[PDB]
Design a protein around this ligand. Structure first.
Ligand SMILES: [Ca+2]
Ligand SMILES: [Ca+2]
Ligand SMILES: [Ca+2]
Length: 114
């Protein structure tokens, strides 16, 4: 990952009750995209929760549980071991390499969420 994208990458959870649950969105090339729910699981969620300082994964809802996003779908088939420090450190399909719709946008509920 080039130094420049590494500097600008960012993760957020949107449309939930607080910052520690919601639809997963990732900042790629200066635009916020969503993550497809294919093979999305608590291991992926766990990386997200820990990265955000949100504790550990409670659950990893697919099927746009927190609503459909509108950006590009930037991540798909995410295969986190659960140990990685950043979601972009997980194996995945490649940026923008998806076969999804926004009705599949992945979500997370973390243990620090209230
Ligand atoms: Ca799916
Ligand atoms: Ca996974
Ligand atoms: Ca897929």
């Amino acid at each position: 990952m080039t130094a420049g994208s590494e500097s600008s990458l960012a993760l957020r959870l949107v449309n939930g009750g607080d910052r520690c649950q919601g639809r997963v969105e990732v900042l790629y090339r200066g635009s916020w995209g969503t993550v497809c729910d294919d093979y999305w699981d608590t291991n992926d969620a766990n990386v997200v929760c820990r990265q955000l300082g949100c504790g550990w994964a409670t659950s990893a809802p697919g099927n746009a549980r927190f609503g459909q996003g509108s950006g590009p779908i930037v991540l798909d088939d995410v295969r986190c071991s659960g140990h990685e420090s950043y979601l972009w450190s997980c194996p995945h399909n490649g940026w923008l390499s998806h076969n999804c719709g926004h009705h599949e946008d992945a979500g997370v509920i973390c243990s620090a969420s209230q």
